[PDB]
Design a protein around this ligand. Structure first.
Ligand SMILES: Nc1ncnc2c1ncn2[C@@H]1O[C@H](COP(=O)(O)OP(=O)(O)OP(=O)(O)O)[C@@H](O)[C@H]1O
Ligand SMILES: Nc1ncnc2c1ncn2[C@@H]1O[C@H](COP(=O)(O)OP(=O)(O)O)[C@@H](O)[C@H]1O
Ligand SMILES: C=C(C)CCOP(=O)(O)OP(=O)(O)O
Ligand SMILES: C=C(C)CCOP(=O)(O)O
Lengths: 261, 239
């Protein structure tokens, strides 16, 4: 029975998603301070954001190795993501939280979606030493393909099964899960609770307005981080002291998922 | 088949006496000499002042003995990963795709030996054309909590793994001497080797040789990679 909270710092918060290689030092500094002020044992995962998505879109890194022109682009992403992780760890180090960057593209491989972690000793030993192992979204060598992209969500799934955290927190730049896109649609209302029946009901699309199933995908990503016990919270990292309050256990504006899968 | 294993020592790529001081101008030139050589290489680099300064300060070489070392070891880990990012940036600028592989995040150690239980990741990176770059770092130890792996230890592991054609050690000396060059200029230069002489000689066998070249001398590493004879120290014969 661990008392650990597994947190994901989405790339849309720690980075300016619209400006390549832009770091929101201000925001990550406050979030790290909120994590320290909470006094909770945590494990941090962060996304790539602008430190990965801008190049991955131009050279189609997600589709794998098709031409030799993506090799310099793939190497640039891995340098950018490791540089971004340095900026995240620096904020944690300044808050008295010893951590270390663990780049998945240099430790693990991928196979049809699964980020394969065959050796758990380095991460487990670093966690036993008090140095928080920080995994992040990265370009990872694939087996059936040349390279593949791992997201912060997938790094969260691996550490979730490895350490069995008591709570999972998703830190995004929005108030939570909505019935549509708030940055586009305004008629959408935040979804407060996410369960299995709502995930199954999310497959219904009478007017055919969510073809890609974005709401269903975001719901499933939260439920798979939940047990019969463990809960998952999607909180706005741009709201000052909101993550701190969530880590203290008090009620905040967020999206809660429970029940498990 | 024709790969050359090169270690960019911390004495040239950093200012060993000034903490967190990167030699950007020197590293870019060495990377340009690697690109101009046209040879397939696998680059290792040391930590220099990005590790040794804080390591000696907190006795990291002795292992985990007190809680005050854990924040120090994490600071060294961040420094080495930040130094490797600067080294990779110079490699990417020279059209050499490479990626940092921190031994403290991938492997473990036991009795002063770097243990690599999984070779698939670093090999698939080399197969993709993205040169995996290891470096001196603090690594979780199996008996001391943590330990310090050197750039030379990363060279020995990568040598037996990929079986390079040539081993080159890049430092601020012209080669091995009978004494310390900085504190003793009367020392004589050693040309061929058939304590650190056995470290170079154990990485050679049959035709593969191990060289120790001056990275501060412009175009000396380039000429060595081109096969020309330069001022250096070479081990021959094998063990
Ligand atoms: N007999 C000797 N031969 C060569 N160097 C010597 C000798 N005696 C003392 N030294 C000192 O050792 C230093 C060599 O640096 P060293 O090889 O430890 O660093 P590096 O290989 O460049 O980087 P790294 O820290 O990654 O190994 C020289 O600066 C020199 O002053
Ligand atoms: N149904 C939805 N509910 C809430 N937010 C959504 C939805 N669809 C799209 N978004 C947008 O997606 C963004 C998050 O992007 P993404 O990269 O998927 O996650 P992260 O925030 O971890 O980077 C949010 O800023 C939000 O505006
Ligand atoms: C964490 C540290 C200090 C690694 C040092 O590696 P080096 O390759 O610079 O080590 P030496 O050979 O100089 O001992
Ligand atoms: C290499 C990339 C783009 C990883 C992206 O990870 P994410 O920010 O969690 O979606």
């Amino acid at each position: 029975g661990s008392h650990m909270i597994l947190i994901k710092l989405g790339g849309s918060v720690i980075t300016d998603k619209s400006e390549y290689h832009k770091f929101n030092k201000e925001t990550v500094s406050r979030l790290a301070d909120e994590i320290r002020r909470s006094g909770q044992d945590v494990m941090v995962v962060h996304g790539a954001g602008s430190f990965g998505h801008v190049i991955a879109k131009k050279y189609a890194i997600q589709d794998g190795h098709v031409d030799d022109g993506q090799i310099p682009a793939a190497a640039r992403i891995m340098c950018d993501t490791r540089e971004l992780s340095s900026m995240v760890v620096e904020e944690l180090l300044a808050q008295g939280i010893p951590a270390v960057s663990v780049a998945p593209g240099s430790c693990f491989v991928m196979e049809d979606g699964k980020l394969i972690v065959d050796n758990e000793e380095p991460i487990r030993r670093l966690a036993d030493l008090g140095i928080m192992p920080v995994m992040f979204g990265d370009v990872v060598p694939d087996r059936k393909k040349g390279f593949a992209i791992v997201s912060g969500d997938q790094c969260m799934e691996v550490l979730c099964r490895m350490f069995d955290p008591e709570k999972v927190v998703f830190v995004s730049d929005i108030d939570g899960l909505y019935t549509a896109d708030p940055k586009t649609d305004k008629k959408a209302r935040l979804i407060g609770e996410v369960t299995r029946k709502k995930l199954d009901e999310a497959l219904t699309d009478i007017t055919v307005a969510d073809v890609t199933g974005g709401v269903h995908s975001k719901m499933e990503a939260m439920l798979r981080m939940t047990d019969r016990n463990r809960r998952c919270y999607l909180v706005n990292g741009n709201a000052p002291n909101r993550l701190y309050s969530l880590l203290k256990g008090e009620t905040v504006t967020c999206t809660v998922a429970k029940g498990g899968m």
